[PDB]
Amino acid sequence: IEAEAASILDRHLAKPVAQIRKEQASAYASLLKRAETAKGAKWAEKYLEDVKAVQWFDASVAEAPASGPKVAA
Amino acid sequence: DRVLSLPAVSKNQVLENVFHTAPKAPVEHLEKMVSANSKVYDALNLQSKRVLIWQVKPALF
Amino acid sequence: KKQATENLMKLLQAYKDIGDAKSEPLLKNHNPRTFEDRDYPVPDFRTQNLKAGDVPKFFDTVISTRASAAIASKDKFWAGRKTEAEAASAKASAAFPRVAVPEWKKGKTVSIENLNTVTDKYAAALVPKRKLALPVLPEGVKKAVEDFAASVGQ
Amino acid sequence: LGPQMEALGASDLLLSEQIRVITEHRYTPDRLQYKEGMKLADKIAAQEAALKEELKVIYGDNVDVKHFQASPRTPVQQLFDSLKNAAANKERAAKEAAAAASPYLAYAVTKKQEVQADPSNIPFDEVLYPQLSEELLELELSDIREDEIALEKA
């Protein structure tokens, strides 16, 4: 796994930045549309619910970056 | 043949052999390294809005 | 790539200190007029059997041939200078300053009082190495003379 | 003479648009010096577009680029044109450092304006490189000397 991560990174650090951004944005957009064309499947609703939970994590660390995400304890 | 006693190298050729490359401005280093160290600040500070420290060493609640 | 950049910088330093050992002017060798042969035997158009419209083509051929010879003499000069500075970029010092980037250790994080000082090192290179001290007039001196002009009613 | 009744820098046209009409007048389109004069007009028009872009932030959109091409700004006028927009520049830098997405970027823009609004930090090539500036003067004095040598041979 270390060799695969280092190989993927050294293939990734050879690109310019706009190529990286459009490649990752294109892959993310295709993988969103493959789960949005799935309607009624349980894995699709769980997929988009986990995407929304990741967006919650990003908003919650944007609200208080020294404390982490807000955990109702 | 007065034209053959003038210098045959044109003023164009002088201006293209003297100013051959467009020189690098000194503010280009500042604006480029600032636009990249803004990303170094964003990922790695503990006061940025998008820090990587919760995506990397998650938490222990 | 870092070794190539360091070799290129040793090459540019070699170019500079063997262009200053000869103390030559800067624009002398990039100007192809200085490599132009002014005392060539300058071909006579009357001994070449031209027709009516053929004389300006003869002048263009003579001028462009002599200009191409001047440019090729410039190129041979710079090939000689390139080998002369490749011979001196080998035995060099290579103690260059490094590019100021913020301190990022492996597990730790960068502090803004280090990003700010590398920004100060970037903006310290925006001042020129020799500058005119253009005196801006402060408000405290222009007002200390403005009220003095207001004292005498001017 | 026609277009050559006035000097190369002493018309009402721009310098590149004067090179164009002088070269259209002295030479037919099939000559060598026609093509070299049109290429020189391209170089001078590139310098004019660069100077218009360098001055349009100060003198407006009707910048009147011919006046500054003929007579460039003295360092005193460079001072007194850096001092008449310094209030608007500092207010722009404050309104942009307030609306930056980072304290890093806010410090970077206020440091760039701190090192740029200082009029002692204008890079003058005549102060930085004296020998290069006088060689750039002699590059045009030598062309005028070659024209004067032709006129004294005539």
Q: What is the 3-state secondary structure of C62-107?
A: HHHHHHHHHHHHHHHHHHHHHHHHHHHHCCCCCCCCCCCCCCCCCC
Residue D143 identity (one-letter amino acid): D
Mapping DSSP onto H, E and C, the string for chain D reads CHHHHCCCCCCCCCHHHHHHHHHHHHCCCCCHHHHHHHHHHHHHHHHHHHHHHHHHHHHCCCCCHHHHHHCCCCHHHHHHHHCCCHHHHHHHHHHHHHCCCCHHHHHHHHHHHHHHCCHHHCCCHHHHCHHHHHHHHHHHHHHHHHHHHHHHHC
Contact (CB, 8 A) for B23 and D50? no
**Residue among D31, D107, D120 whose CB faces C132 most closely:** D120
DSSP 8-state symbol, A69: S
Cα separation of the two ends of chain C: 68
C33 touches chain D (CB under 8 A): yes
Q: How far is C63 from chain B (nearest CA, A)?
A: 5
Contact D102 B48 (CB under 8 A): yes
Q: CA B14 → CA B5, B8, C71, C121, D107, distances in Å?
A: 17, 11, 10, 37, 44
What letters, b where the CB count within 10 A reaches 16 and e where it falls short, cover A9-44?
eeeeeeeeeeeeeeeeeeeeeeeeeebeeeeeeeee
Contact (CB, 8 A) for C70 and C36? yes
Contact C134 D75 (CB under 8 A): yes
C52 touches chain D (CB under 8 A): no
Residue A54 CB partners (closer than 8 Å, separation 6+) = none
* Closest by Cα among D115, D74, D125, D76 to D93: D115
Contact B47 A65 (CB under 8 A): yes
* Whole-angstrom distance, CA of residue B10 vs CA of residue D27: 14
* Closest by Cα among C71, C70, C48, C72 to C58: C48
Contact B8 C43 (CB under 8 A): no
With touching defined as 3 or more inter-chain CB pairs under 8 Å, the answer for chains D and C is yes
Contact (CB, 8 A) for B14 and C31? yes
Contact C71 B30 (CB under 8 A): no
Contact A62 B61 (CB under 8 A): no
* Whole-angstrom distance, CA of residue C146 vs CA of residue C34: 57
* Closest by Cα among D70, D64, D63, D62 to D44: D70
Phi/psi of residue D142, nearest 5 degrees:
-75, -35
* Whole-angstrom distance, CA of residue C69 vs CA of residue C32: 10
Helix (H) or strand (E) holding A32: helix A17-36
Judging contacts by C-beta atoms under 8 Å, the chain C residues touching residue D119 are: 134, 136
Contact A65 B61 (CB under 8 A): no
CA C40 to chain centre: 32
Q: How far is D132 from chain C (nearest CA, A)?
A: 6
Cα–Cα–Cα angle for C40, C46, C50, rounded to 5 degrees:
115
* Whole-angstrom distance, CA of residue A16 vs CA of residue C5: 19
Q: How far is B21 from chain A (nearest CA, A)?
A: 24
Query: Exposed/middle/buried for D132, CB within 10 Å: 0-12, 13-18, 19+?
Result: middle
D31 touches chain C (CB under 8 A): yes
CA D55 to chain centre: 9
Contact (CB, 8 A) for C97 and B39? no
* Whole-angstrom distance, CA of residue B7 vs CA of residue D143: 9
Q: How far is A32 from chain B (nearest CA, A)?
A: 21
- The CB-side HSE value for C6 (13 A sphere, CA atoms) comes to 12
Residue A65: count other Cβ atoms within 10 Å of its Cβ: 17
Contact B10 D105 (CB under 8 A): no
For chain B, state the CA radius of gyration. 27
Structure-determination technique:
cryo-EM
Residue D115 CB partners (closer than 8 Å, separation 6+) = C123, C124, C126, C127, D121
Total residues found in chain B within this entry: 61
Q: How far is D94 from chain C (nearest CA, A)?
A: 18
Judging contacts by C-beta atoms under 8 Å, the chain A residues touching residue B47 are: 65-66
Q: How far is B31 from chain A (nearest CA, A)?
A: 16
Query: Exposed/middle/buried for B30, CB within 10 Å: 0-12, 13-18, 19+?
Result: buried
Judging contacts by C-beta atoms under 8 Å, the chain A residues touching residue B35 are: none
Substitution target in A61, A63, A67 with the highest count of B β-carbons within 10 Å is A61
D104 touches chain B (CB under 8 A): yes
Contact C63 B3 (CB under 8 A): yes
* Whole-angstrom distance, CA of residue B7 vs CA of residue C137: 50
Q: Within the 94-113 window of chain C, which residues sit less than 8 Å (CB to CB) from chain D?
A: 112
Contact (CB, 8 A) for D8 and D15? yes
